[PDB]
Amino acid sequence: MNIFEMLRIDEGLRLKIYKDTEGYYTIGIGHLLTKSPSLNAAKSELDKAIGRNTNGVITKDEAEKLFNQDVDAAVRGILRNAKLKPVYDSLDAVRRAAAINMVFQMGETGVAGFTNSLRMLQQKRWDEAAVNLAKSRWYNQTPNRAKRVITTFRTGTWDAYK
Ligand SMILES: [Ar]
Ligand SMILES: [Cl-]
Ligand SMILES: [Cl-]
Numbered sequence: 001m002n003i004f005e006m007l008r009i010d011e012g013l014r015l016k017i018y019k020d021t022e023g024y025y026t027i028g029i030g031h032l033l034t035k036s037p038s039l040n041a042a043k044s045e046l047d048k049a050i051g052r053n054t055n056g057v058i059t060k061d062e063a064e065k066l067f068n069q070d071v072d073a074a075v076r077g078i079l080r081n082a083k084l085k086p087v088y089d090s091l092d093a094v095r096r097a098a099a100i101n102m103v104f105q106m107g108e109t110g111v112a113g114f115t116n117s118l119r120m121l122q123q124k125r126w127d128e129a130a131v132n133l134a135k136s137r138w139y140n141q142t143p144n145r146a147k148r149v150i151t152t153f154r155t156g157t158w159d160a161y162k
Contacts, residue, residue: 001158003071003097007104009161010145013063017042017056021142027056028063030104031070074100077108084112087122095121098152105145106138121153130154 011030017039020026025033025042033045046054050062058066078084078099088099099121102111112118114136120129130150133139139146148160 001097001161003100004067006097006158006161007067007071007101010101010105010148013060015058015060015063017046027058027066029067029070031063031066070104071100074104078103081108081112083115083118084108087118090122090124092156094156094158095153098149101149101152102138110138126154126156 008029013029014027017025017027017033020030020032024035025039025045027033027046031049033042033049036042043054043056046056046058049066050058078088084099084103088096091099099111114133117129117132120132130153133150133153134146136146139150151160152158
């Protein structure tokens with residue numbers, strides 16, 4: 001397992017524009033197009049992203065391309081965030097994949113607000129971090145996914161994804 005297979009499992013793959021768990025237009029592997037309620041707006045942002053008139057539909061390769069850019073962007077975001085980087089550099093490889101998953105889902109911003117959890121992770125207090133992580137709107141809204149990521153930070157293994 002790795003970061004790509006992990007997010008491919010949590011996000012799925014859809015080749016036509018769809019609405020995500022929050023009702024926002026998305027496509028591919030969890031690639032958010034816009035928070036706007038306008039489908040047109042979404043179609044415009046997709047065309048701009050792909051570089052052609054897609055008419056709301058993309059191929060597998062194109063979805064995979066957006067995905068690669070999105071993961072890379074997520075890592076880069078972490079390394080650029082002063083609150084995130086130190087945590088991230090302190091973790092082992094498996095747990096770093098968990099941190100990337102969260103950033104991919106909720107943004108650098110969103111994750112950087114889990115102050116207390118971040119500090120517990122930095123201290124390697126796994127069980128405590130796992131309990132604090134679950135006290136969040138994130139866990140109550142997407143509990144199955146949150147549980148998989150949480151177990152990942154807790155154990156340092158990929159058992160939740162096997
Ligand atoms: Ar992080
Ligand atoms: Cl883009
Ligand atoms: Cl879920």
